[PDB]
Every structure is written in C-alpha cells, then in structure tokens.
Amino acid sequence: KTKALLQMVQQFAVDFEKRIEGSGGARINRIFHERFPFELVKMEFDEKELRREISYAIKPDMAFETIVKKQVKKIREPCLKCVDMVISELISTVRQCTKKQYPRLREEMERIVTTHIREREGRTKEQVMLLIDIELAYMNTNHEDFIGFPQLERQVETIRNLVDSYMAIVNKTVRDLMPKTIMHLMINNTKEFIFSELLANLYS
Amino acid sequence: KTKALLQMVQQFAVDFEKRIEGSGGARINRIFHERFPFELVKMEFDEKELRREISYAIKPDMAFETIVKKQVKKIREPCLKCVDMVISELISTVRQCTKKQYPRLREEMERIVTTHIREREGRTKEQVMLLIDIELAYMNTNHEDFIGFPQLERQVETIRNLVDSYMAIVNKTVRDLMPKTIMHLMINNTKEFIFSELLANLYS
Amino acid sequence: KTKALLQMVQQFAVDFEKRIEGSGGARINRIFHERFPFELVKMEFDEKELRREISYAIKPDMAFETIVKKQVKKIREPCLKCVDMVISELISTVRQCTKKQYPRLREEMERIVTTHIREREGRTKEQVMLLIDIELAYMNTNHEDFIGFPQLERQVETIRNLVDSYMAIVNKTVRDLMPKTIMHLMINNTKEFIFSELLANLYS
Amino acid sequence: KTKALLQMVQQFAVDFEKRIEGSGGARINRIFHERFPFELVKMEFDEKELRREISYAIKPDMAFETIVKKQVKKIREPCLKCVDMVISELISTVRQCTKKQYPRLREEMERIVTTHIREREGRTKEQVMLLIDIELAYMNTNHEDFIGFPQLERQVETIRNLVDSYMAIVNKTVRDLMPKTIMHLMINNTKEFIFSELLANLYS
Amino acid sequence: MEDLIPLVNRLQDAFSAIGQNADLDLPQIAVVGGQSAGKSSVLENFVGRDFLPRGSGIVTRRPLVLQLVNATTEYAEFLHCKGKKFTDFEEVRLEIEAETDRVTGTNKGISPVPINLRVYSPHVLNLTLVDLPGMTKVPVGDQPPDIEFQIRDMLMQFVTKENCLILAVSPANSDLANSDALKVAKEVDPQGQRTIGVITKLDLMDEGTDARDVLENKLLPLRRGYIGVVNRSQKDIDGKKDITAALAAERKFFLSHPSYRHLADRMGTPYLQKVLNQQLTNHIRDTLPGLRNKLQSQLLSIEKEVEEYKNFRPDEMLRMYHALKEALSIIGNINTT
Amino acid sequence: MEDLIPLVNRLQDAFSAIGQNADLDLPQIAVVGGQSAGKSSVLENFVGRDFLPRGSGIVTRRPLVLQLVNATTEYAEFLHCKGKKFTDFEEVRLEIEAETDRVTGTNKGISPVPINLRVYSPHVLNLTLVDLPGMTKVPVGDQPPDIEFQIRDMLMQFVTKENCLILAVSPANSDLANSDALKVAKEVDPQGQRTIGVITKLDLMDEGTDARDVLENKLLPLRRGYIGVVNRSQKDIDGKKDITAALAAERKFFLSHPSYRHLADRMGTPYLQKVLNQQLTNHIRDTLPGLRNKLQSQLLSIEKEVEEYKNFRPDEMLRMYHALKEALSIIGNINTT
Amino acid sequence: ILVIRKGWLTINNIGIMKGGSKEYWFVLTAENLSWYKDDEEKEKKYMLSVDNLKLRDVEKGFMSSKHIFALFNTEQRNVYKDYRQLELACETQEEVDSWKASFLRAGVYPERV
Amino acid sequence: ILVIRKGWLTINNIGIMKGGSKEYWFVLTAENLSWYKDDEEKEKKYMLSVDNLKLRDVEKGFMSSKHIFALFNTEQRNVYKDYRQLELACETQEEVDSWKASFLRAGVYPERV
C-alpha cells in the first residue's frame, strides 16, 4: 500500500489535463459533439403545433403555457445520450489503475474507492436535468422575431406574432448546450479523483 | 328600511352597467383607453443596456443566464397613468343614484359600503407591480441562445447577437395587459359588496 | 347558505360582461341578428295598398291615418320572435347556479329567487310593445322621397307624391331596431341579477 | 218687425254666396289666394339645423327619437298673412244689404249680431296655431330611420343621412291647409247666427 | 192772345213752388225807328195805355226802363221825382212829358241817361217794356256826329231777344237803303212771320222819287208785307195837339199809286193786330219740349229710390212726388190748345 | 257689475296667499273735459257719492289723489288738514269744497298741486279714483298761456290705462275740432265700445252754427254714439245751488233738431249705465289666459320632483301642492260666467 | 381614419374625348387618396393607395400656364385610361406646396423628381 | 485581429448604371481591407488582401473637386467590374492623410506613385 500509492500513481495523474484540453479531448470533441446535433432534431419539435394552444388560451405569456410542459419531457431523450458517451471512457479510467493483483491488497483497496465515485458521478448528470425543468417558470415569447402590428382592437393583435418563433429556436439551444456543459462540468469532478483523490483516501 | 333595500337598490342594479360603459361618463371613458397606448412606446427601452451582464457571467450556459433581471426597473413609470382616469367616473357613479331622500337611510347606507370600494380600487394598481417582479425569477439558458460557432474568435462571435431580442419583449406586454385589467377589476369587483351583504351588515 | 352565497357565486358573476360584449355575445350577435331581417319581410307590407286610402281620404297627414292602425298589428309577429330567442339562454342562466342539492337548502333558496325574475322579465318585452303603438299619433308622410310639383289647383297636388314612400321604409326600420334594442335593454336587467342580485336578496 | 225679419232677411240670403265668391269683392278675393303660396316657400327651412339634436340622444332607437320637436318655431310667420285679406270683403258684405231704412230696426239688428262675428272670425287664425303645436308630441323612431350598417365607423355612418328628410315636410303642409281653411270657416260659420237665432234673440 | 197770357202765368206759379227755373220769358215790346218816325205814337196805341213821352221831330229822347213788379204797397216812384208817390196814372203821364220838354228843349236833343220809374201793383204781370231813342243817320241840334252808332248799340241789347216784336218804323223822305231801322228788324226775323214793316211819310216823298222796289215786297220779301202810318207833323205837335189828327192822312198814299194798289188787303193798323197774335202762341211751343223734360227727370230720379225704400233701414222723397204731378199738367194743356 | 266686483276680489286674496302677482287691475274712473264741461258733476253722479269739489266755470281746479286702503283704524286725514280725523263723510265734503273756493277765488284759477286725502276703511276695495283738472284751449284768470299743454300731460298718466272709462265731456259753444277732451277718449278706444261721448251746451250754441257732422256719428263713429248733458249755469253755481236744477235742460236739444231725432233711443244718463257694464266683464277675460298659465306652471314643476321623491335620500313641495288647487278654481268660474 | 384634407385639383391634361380640363374631387385620408367624377361618389374613376405614393415637380408639362406636379404609381406607367401621368395643376406654386404638407401626414413624401 | 480602423470613403467614379457616387463601407484590420454594399455585409462586392497593397496619390483624377488616391492590386489592372482604378475620395488632403496611417499599421506602405 505504501509502495503502490506513493510512486506508481503519480505519473498516471498528469496525463489528464494535458490530452483533454490540448477518448481523450482531441477527438472526444470533434467526433462526439458535432454528430450529436442530429440526435436533437429527431426527438424534438417546432412549427404549427405551437400556434393552436396559444390562440385559444387567451379567449401573451399566460397563453403560451401549455406547450412547454410536454416539450421538455421530449428534450430528455436527446440530451442524456450525449452525456453517457463521455462517461464511458472517463468514469472507468479512475478505477483503471487502482488494482495496480495481490489478494491481500485488493480487499482493502476496493472498499475505499468504489463508494466515492458512486455518489459523485450523479452530480454531473443532475445538472443536465436542471436545465430542462427550467422552462416552466416564465416562458418569454417575444423572441428575436418581429413585433406585432368594443375594446377588442388592442388585445388580440399582440398574441399572433410572438409565440411562433420559440419552438424551433429552443431546439437549436440544446444541441450546443449539452456538449459545452460536459467540458466544464463532467470533466472536473471525475478528473480530480484519479489524478489525486485516490492516493489521498486510503491514508486518511 | 326593509322596503328601502328592496326598491332603492333595484333600479341602481340596471344603472351600473349602463352609466359606466354607455359627453357623459359613457364615452368620456372609452376615449381615454385608446390614447393610453401611445404613452407606453416612448418611455421604455431596448438595445445596448442589456449587454453589460455578460462580463461577469462567462467566467457558456452560465454566461447566458444573467440577462433577464435588469429589464424590470423602468416599466413602473407608464402603467400607473391609465388606472387613475377610470377611477373618477366609476366611484362617483355609485353615489349618483344611491339616494333613490333620507336623514337616516341614504347616509347610513354610505358608512358601511365605502370601505369595500377602498380596498377594491387598489386591486388594479397592484397588478402592475406584480408583472414587474414576476420577470426576475427565471434566467433560462434555453432562451434565444443560438447554437455555438488569443481565443478572441469564440468570445465575440455569439455574444454580440444575443442581447437584441430580450430587450423588445417588455414593450409588447404592457400595451394589452393594462386595458384588460380594468374590465375585470375596477367595474365589477366593488359592485358585489354594496349589492348584497349590505342588507345584513347594517343591523350587524 | 353562508358558504354557498359568499364564495361560490362570485366567480360566476364576472363571466357576463366579458363574453357578451367582447349563446354569449360573440355569436349571439352574428347568427341571430342578421338572419332576423328575413322574418321581417314576410309578415309586413308596402307598395300600392297605401295609395288607395289616402287619395279618397281628403275628398295631407289626415288622409294617411287609416293605414297605420292595421299595419302596426302586423309588426308584432316579426318583432316578438327575435326577442324570445335571446331570452332563452339568458333568463335561464340566472337560476342556472342557484341550486348550487341539500333539501334543507333548496326550500328557502327557491322562494326568494323565482319571484324577483318573474316581475322583471316583463320590462324588456314591454319596451318592444311601446315602439309599435307609437305610430298612431302623428304619421308624417313627407319622407325622404321627393316633394310634389275653383281653388282645386293647389289642394290635391300635394297629396299624391308624399304618402307612398312610408310603407316600405318603416319595415326597413323594425328589422334593425329590434336587434339593437335587445343589447342595451334585454341585457342589463337580467345581467344584474345573476352577477349580484342573487347573493343580496337571501341576506337582506 | 215680424214682417221686417220675414222679408229683409230673405233677399240677404241669396246675397251672401253671390257677393263673396262672385273689380268688386268677387275676384278681388280670388286673386289674393293664388299669390299667397309664394310667401310660404322662402321663409321656411331645411338642411343642417335639424342635425344638432343627435348629440345628446345617442348616449340607437333613443338617439333617433329627438328629431321632431325643433321644427315648429319658424312656421308661425307665414300662415297668418292670408287670413287678413279675406276678412275685409266678408265682414263688410253683411252690412251692405242688412238695411233692406230704420231709426229702430236696422240699428237694433246690428247690436246682437256683431258679437257672433267676433268670435267666429277668430276660428281660422287659431287653426294655424294648432298645426304647429300638434307636431311636438310624437318623436317616433320608426320614422325614416334606415337599417343599420375607436368605434368611429358605426357613429357617422347612419347619422349623416338621417337629418335631410324631416326638414322638408313642414313646407308642403302649409301651402294647402291655409287655403282650405277659409272656405269652411270664414264664410259659412258667421252666417248661421244672424240668419236664424236673431228673430228670437232680439226680444230676448 | 188768350193762349199767351193765362197759360204762361199759371205755369209760372207752379214752377216757383218747386224752386225751378220758371222761365216763360214774356214778350218785351219795343219801338225802334228813324228820327221823327213816330215810335212813341205807335207803341202807346198798340199797348193800350198813355204813358210814353211824345213830342215833335225825334220823340223818344231818353230811355224809359219800366219794370212792373207785383207788390202789396201799390204806388209809383220816379228816380227824378223823389219823395212823391203817384196814385193817379194820368198824373204820371203829365209829369213824364212835361219834364222831358222842359229839360232838353224842342230842338231834337237826346240823352242816354234813363228815367227810372217802377210801378208796383198786384194787378199786373211781371213784364218789361222799353221805349228807346230813335236811330238817326244824320246829326241835329246837340247830337254827336257819330250819333248813328251810339244809339244803335244801346237799343240792340233789348231788341235782339227772340221774343221781341219789332215795329221797324222808317221815314220814306230819307234814304231807305241806309236806314238803320229796317236793318235791325230784318236781322231778327228775316222771313217776316212776326215782322211787319212800318214805312211812314210815303205820300210826303220828294217829287221825282219813289220806293217802288221796297214797297212791292220783292227786294226783301216779308211774309206779312208792309203797313204804312202817317204821324203828327211839326206844326201840330208843338201845341199839345193829340194823336187822333195825324191818323187821317195814313190811308191816302197806298190807294192811288198803280204799283202798290195790289197789297191793300194787308194794310192798316187794324190788320197788324190780327196776324201778330198767332205767332205769339208759337213761341211757347218751341220752349215746351225742354221745360217738360226737366220736370219728368226729377220724378224718375226718386222712382228707383222707392224700390230701395221698402225693406231695412235706409224722406224728402215722399213730399216731392206729389208736387211734380201738378206742374206737368199745365205744359200738356198748351200743346193740346 | 256683478261679475266685476265679487269675482275679482275673491281671486285677489288667493293670489296674496301664494305671494304671486295678484294683478286684476280694477278700473280707475276719471273725468276729463273742457273748461266748464261739468266733469265733477258727471263723476259724482255715476260713482254715487258726494265728495268731489264742484264750482263755477272750471270745476276740478286741483288734482285729488284718493287711495282707499283697507285698514283697521278707520279714519281719514288730509295733507292740508293735519291733526284732525273726520269720521263724518259729509263733513269731509264740506271741508274740501270750502277750502278750494277760499284759496283760488271764483275766477277760474287752477293749481297742479294735489290735495292728498286717504280714506282707511275695512268696507272698501283697493281702488284709485282721480278727478283731474279740465283741459282748455284758451287762458282765463291766472292760468298760463300754454295751459292747454301743461294740463294735458298731467291727466294722461292716469287716462292712458287700458281699464279707464273716459267720459270725454266737451262744450258745443267752443270749437269741437280743436277739442282736447274728445281727442284723448278717441285715442284709447277708437271703436267706441266703452267710450260714450258727452257733448254739452248743444242747445246753448251760437246762432248760425251746428255740429251736424259730429253729432250724426259719421265723421268719427263710436259704437255707442253720444249722450248729451246740460250742467249748471254761471249764475246758479255761485249760491251753492245744488246739482238737480241743471239736469232739466238736458233732454230738450236732442228732440227737436231734424238731423238728430234718429238717435233718441241711445240718449240719456240712464242709457249710459246699461251699456257700460257689459264691457267691464270682458276686460277680465283677456287677462285670464295669462294668469291661469302662471298657476299651472308651478304645479307641473313639482310633479316630476314627486317622481324622484319616493326611493332613497333626496320638503316644501308637499305643502305647496294643496295651495295651488284653490287658486285655479276661481279663474275657471269667470270663464264659465 | 382622420381626414387630413379634401380639396379640388384640376386635371389639366384630360383628353378631347372627355370634356376637356375639368376639376375632379380629391379625398385624402391617412390611408387613401381617391378621386371620383364628383363628390357624390357614384362613379369611382380610381382609388389609389397612399402606400408607395411619392410626389415630383413635373417640369412645366405641356405648353400652358399651369405649374404641374404629379402623383405616380411605383408599379406602373399610366394612372388611368390613356393618360401618361396624372397631371395635377395649380395656378400658383404655393397652391402646389400646401398640398405637399397634406400628403406628408399620410405618408406621401417628396423627391423622386 | 485588432481592428485598426473602420471608416467610410466615397467611390467618386461609380458608373451611371449603379446609382452614381455613393459611400461604401470599408473595414480595415491587420489582414484585410474589405468593402461591402453596406455595413450589414449581405453583399460582398469585394474582399481585398492587405498583402501587397500600396497607395498612391492619384493626380486629381476626373475634373472634379475631389482629391483622389487609389488602392491598386500589384497583380492586375481593374479592381472590380469595369472601373479602371478604385477611386477613393476625400474633400480635404488631410482626410486622405489620416487613412494613410491606418494602412501603415496593416502593412500598406506608401509610394509607387
């Protein structure tokens, strides 16, 4: 235990920032991230569905409401998939060095390591979940799209133009947002462990 | 007094739609409403103010987030003005044919009834405040945000466009929401009390 | 009784101005009112009947007389029918909420309500009747039509041109007049009741 | 005196059609009548005066109603003029052959008889007044009123046309009614008394 | 004569009562004639009274305007005899004649100044008799040289009247063609129905002359021809010798002249009376149509008024109706003779 | 007369209670007339009381403004008789007449200065009687030369009133065409329904004149024509000879003149009474429509107020409603006779 | 909605075959400038949108006394019938000018001369 | 990378067939001087490398009031379309001069006049 932690697992550490920020980061980035967007389009929607609910609803923001609740449910499918792909190589790397063979050594060694990673892998995934729930609270609709234009004349005018834009564009959002996310987030949590975390626990 | 309620507050019943919504009060009022909107446009804002927020946030999803908060502050000014104009004709409407004579009755009738009208004229004004606060509690990043794409090239590319949309949105809202308000609130609300609980209350 | 009147029948109230003045008012107006005129034509008359009586009568206003007495009798048929159509949905609405089920509650509840509506539904209908009787008192005949042109020469000249116009045009009148009437009149009386009237009586 | 009535008031009998209706009185009179009408046209009114009434009334059936009243005021002027011209020849007609001599008879005969003529010359003038007052007591809305069809579009559409017709009407009336009057009244009425009750009366 | 006096006077009174123009202008008789023709002698004989100044040569030497006026006092007063009233008509004559001779002399002198005398009596008709000074062709005594013209105009105011019986007396011993006397009479009645020419001194003509043409009534014919008279000579008159003596000579001339014998049956003063009367009646006849019509008109006037009288209140009319009836009857009677 | 007194007074009290314009302007009777026309004699006869100064020649020589005023004290006080209150009306007359004669003399003198006397009594109607000085055309005594105009203006303030019965008295022995008296009366009532012309001294006219045109009622016709009167002569008046004696002469003139016999049935003082009464009633009739309308208006006014009275909180109104009812009834009664 | 104007203008170049130069009734609002044969509007010779209307000073025109200006459709040559341009004429320059301010309000701006 | 400039210049010799003399939007950096039809950059009329750009005072030019200078490609005659040279104009000499310093930084040096 003294020999194994002290020397062997320090050359292992420095390999991680490096390659990732110049699979490792070189082609983690190109392949995965830029083929991800396709995934997006399929299990998501825009256009004329959006129009129906809003117009009935008034008879501007309040009308919009019904849409987003069911739409966000559909955003789980694509977003999650990208996440998992990163996880495979990176999460398994940490344990990928921690066995060093000796049956005396393995028994103590395992119990300390496995449980730490267990709790912490959940963090990153959860942050993705957060983004989806977000929608329900405000739902502004006056978008980068262009503005509209007894006492009917002022009221309904404003409804029509606004809502329509949002459905397409929100979909645009997620496709880039997941990939970006991962680099900052996914990355740091686990990174620590294998680099440094590992040697630390067994002692302490 | 039992007879007094039965007939005096019977003709008043039809008097209330009539006078308020029909120069007299009828179309003095309506005129007011269709001159209101012009006030809104001028005294509100767009463009470069919003942009400031970016600088703290970035140091991608987190960076976009900040935007929404800062818009609210200026929107108090316009909204109030409309409210006051309505008040004049309506409060004085009730008293104009609530006399039906008395040293006893006409007066005593007033003393309980006024107190409702105080609390209920307040409603409408309050709705203006509500709208402004509501905005702050969101900061979505699935908003307008569009798809991605020393390291100057990545920094300015997205940020520049971002600001434009969100600024617009508050302007549309106000013009429609203020007018609607009055119909529901001013007119009906206050009517209820004096119409019904009055008979009982006065003995108490 | 305290629970039922106080809360339950206040959300019921505000529904009435609203929809009617933007069946409810949306398609009460289009359908009923603009198919009504047809009704008119049938059971009413114009043209050459009018000519006969006037010319004999002198041997200008006095001559006209005989016509209108029997003509007004015929105006009852069409006018009434429009009236009733509005009544059906609106008069029955008020009682349409006043039962809330409890046999203890129903007995008191019914006796107070039914009799009020009874007396007041008659008002509106009566106003229609008034319009018809009106004719007999003056009967001017020099209409928008064009003027005419021993001591015979001045007298009879004037008779011919005038009378003829009126028969057609008076029929034109009624077809628009009934529909218009209803909105102002019908409307307000009952409106009050269900909105406010109802809660009031039981207490008082 | 018994003989005196029997023959003196026998030749007078035929004298009365004769002289009045046949220069003498015969065609001095007739001429007068056919120069009368021209007076009427000038000194009466149409067009825009009527229009004023609308403004109070509207705030649809009620709005039309007001019209009729305001016309009457100017119609006094012309009508009177005709009357006077007739008077001259007719009153002096009776006396021209009522003498048949006397210190007793011719004179005494006058004293009772004149008093009828006073009251009865008045008739004709009075009929002019009557016609004017009669008008005010109507205000029908089935009049000329034509079929219907911020809210500017509904306001001016109907109102504009409305005024034109009613203004005309008074003008026709006057020209025919004045001439007729004289025949019935002036001439015959006064004759009656002196012809018959005279014989008895004088003893009294 | 019986038609002229009675009928006229009777009519005249009725006309007075109605207050109308009575008229019925009674004949004025005047004698005109040459100097010494005998005018006063002729006039007084025919009238039947002695009251005209008479004298020698020229006789009427001053106008005598006499007016007979019916009046109750019965007297007479001269303009020159003031303060005396004569009741004796013979005394009247004596005064007139004496006064004339005394004041002018007996040498033909004349005077245009009238002698005014008015005889008031109830037994007379309202008449005017006028004796006028004799016309001359030649001056005598104290007469002017243009005496011929002055006298002529004076007399003409009376003699022109339609009802004036002119006895134009002319001396044959003076130029008949230059006689004023005959001219006047021929002027008023050319036909000679009521003019009878009196020629004097025909037997007293100068030897060697005669009036054959005039006297034979062919030069200027008259219906009744001529009647001659021979008045008092110069010697006789002076003594107050009376009228009678002159008359005797008168016949002699007409008888013996071969050229004038033929008209003897239309000679004398007596013959003159007979014819004259017939003409007088005629005069009334010509005036009658006019007078009658005036009376008729007044009656008719009120007739229509009567028609309107009867019946009603409307009186002199009634009284008037009766008065008219009387007047009409008199007019008719003259027409029916 | 029975329509005028009772009905008017009764109406007047009701109007007082409402605090409105009572009106019902009762006839003022005033006598105007030429100098010596007899104005005081005529006036006191018709009214029925002896209280007017009377005297010779010109009679009314000072204005007497008398006001009858209903009041509880019952007395009388003269402006010139201060400190004395008469209770004997006969004593009133004696004082008035004596004082006038003593101060002006008996030579026609006049004075514009009124004699103020006010008779307070509960047994009278609120009336104004005015005797006025007689108009002249010619000065006498100590009257000014333009007296004609001064007197005329003075009287006109009273006589122009629509309810003034003018007895225009004018002497026939003075120029009628230049008479001020007749002009005034003809001005106010040209038709002659209520003006009856009083012409005096018609039998006292100068020989050789007559009033034929005026008297025959064709120059300026009146409905009721004329009535003559003959008042006291100069000699009689001086002695305090009473009114009675003058009257006798009055009839004589009208009877005997052929041109005026025809109007005899419209002659006398007695006849004047009968006609006059009928006109008086008529006056009320013309004013009635106006008065009635005023009363009606007030009633209607509060009627709509009654409509708003009923229901709610909003009181003189109630009391007023009843008061009006009374007033209306009286007006109707005069119309229905 | 608001009436900006209403005023007569003379179409100075009206054909031989149409009576000659007559005055025709213009009605200007914030939305249209329409002209009829007269003010009763029984006709409708044309109804021109105020949208895309521009105004130019038409250089004298014919050899007349009129000072002409024209309204022209951005989309086409002729305005109505066989007319080349719709010639509107005033006797004074100023008269043309006052109408320019009324067009201004409705969104007919100058230039494109 | 660093923006040296950005400023308008008037192409004074723009054809009849292209609106006439208009101002066009120049963007200068250390690497390129590009000009578009306007500042939105929907167009790209050209994108000129800053490499081998040199600057000369073009001797008056046309008979105008402009003081002209030109940017010219070492490799070819015409700069774009049928233009002869790309004429850039300023009303003052000084205005031309301030731009010379901005080119200096990017490697556009003077001479070759």
UniProtKB/Swiss-Prot annotation, chains A, B, C, D:
<protein>
    <recommendedName>
        <fullName>Dynamin-1</fullName>
    </recommendedName>
</protein>
<comment type="subunit">
    <text>Homodimer; homodimerization is mediated by the dynamin-type G domain which promotes assembly-stimulated GTPase activity. Homo-tetramer formed from two dimers in the absence of lipid. Oligomerizes into a helical polymer that self-assembles around the vesicle membrane, when associated to the menbrane through lipid binding.</text>
</comment>
<comment type="similarity">
    <text>Belongs to the TRAFAC class dynamin-like GTPase superfamily. Dynamin/Fzo/YdjA family.</text>
</comment>
<comment type="function">
    <text>Catalyzes the hydrolysis of GTP and utilizes this energy to mediate vesicle scission and participates in many forms of endocytosis, such as clathrin-mediated endocytosis or synaptic vesicle endocytosis as well as rapid endocytosis (RE). Associates to the membrane, through lipid binding, and self-assembles into rings and stacks of interconnected rings through oligomerization to form a helical polymer around the vesicle membrane leading to constriction of invaginated coated pits around their necks.</text>
</comment>
From Swiss-Prot, chains E, F:
<dbReference type="InterPro" id="IPR003130">
    <property type="entry name" value="GED"/>
</dbReference>
<feature type="region of interest" description="G2 motif">
    <location>
        <begin position="59"/>
        <end position="61"/>
    </location>
</feature>
<dbReference type="InterPro" id="IPR011993">
    <property type="entry name" value="PH-like_dom_sf"/>
</dbReference>
<feature type="region of interest" description="G1 motif">
    <location>
        <begin position="33"/>
        <end position="40"/>
    </location>
</feature>
<comment type="function">
    <text>Catalyzes the hydrolysis of GTP and utilizes this energy to mediate vesicle scission and participates in many forms of endocytosis, such as clathrin-mediated endocytosis or synaptic vesicle endocytosis as well as rapid endocytosis (RE). Associates to the membrane, through lipid binding, and self-assembles into rings and stacks of interconnected rings through oligomerization to form a helical polymer around the vesicle membrane leading to constriction of invaginated coated pits around their necks.</text>
</comment>
<dbReference type="InterPro" id="IPR027417">
    <property type="entry name" value="P-loop_NTPase"/>
</dbReference>
<comment type="subunit">
    <text>Homodimer; homodimerization is mediated by the dynamin-type G domain which promotes assembly-stimulated GTPase activity. Homo-tetramer formed from two dimers in the absence of lipid. Oligomerizes into a helical polymer that self-assembles around the vesicle membrane, when associated to the menbrane through lipid binding.</text>
</comment>
<dbReference type="InterPro" id="IPR019762">
    <property type="entry name" value="Dynamin_GTPase_CS"/>
</dbReference>
<feature type="region of interest" description="G3 motif">
    <location>
        <begin position="131"/>
        <end position="134"/>
    </location>
</feature>
<feature type="modified residue" description="Phosphotyrosine; alternate">
    <location>
        <position position="120"/>
    </location>
</feature>
<feature type="region of interest" description="G5 motif">
    <location>
        <begin position="230"/>
        <end position="233"/>
    </location>
</feature>
<feature type="binding site">
    <location>
        <position position="203"/>
    </location>
    <ligand>
        <name>GDP</name>
    </ligand>
</feature>
<feature type="binding site">
    <location>
        <position position="41"/>
    </location>
    <ligand>
        <name>GDP</name>
    </ligand>
</feature>
<feature type="binding site">
    <location>
        <position position="55"/>
    </location>
    <ligand>
        <name>GDP</name>
    </ligand>
</feature>
<dbReference type="Pfam" id="PF00169">
    <property type="entry name" value="PH"/>
</dbReference>
<feature type="binding site">
    <location>
        <position position="39"/>
    </location>
    <ligand>
        <name>GDP</name>
    </ligand>
</feature>
<feature type="binding site">
    <location>
        <position position="206"/>
    </location>
    <ligand>
        <name>GDP</name>
    </ligand>
</feature>
<dbReference type="Pfam" id="PF02212">
    <property type="entry name" value="GED"/>
</dbReference>
<feature type="binding site">
    <location>
        <position position="234"/>
    </location>
    <ligand>
        <name>GDP</name>
    </ligand>
</feature>
<feature type="binding site">
    <location>
        <position position="231"/>
    </location>
    <ligand>
        <name>GDP</name>
    </ligand>
</feature>
<feature type="modified residue" description="Phosphotyrosine">
    <location>
        <position position="75"/>
    </location>
</feature>
<dbReference type="Pfam" id="PF00350">
    <property type="entry name" value="Dynamin_N"/>
</dbReference>
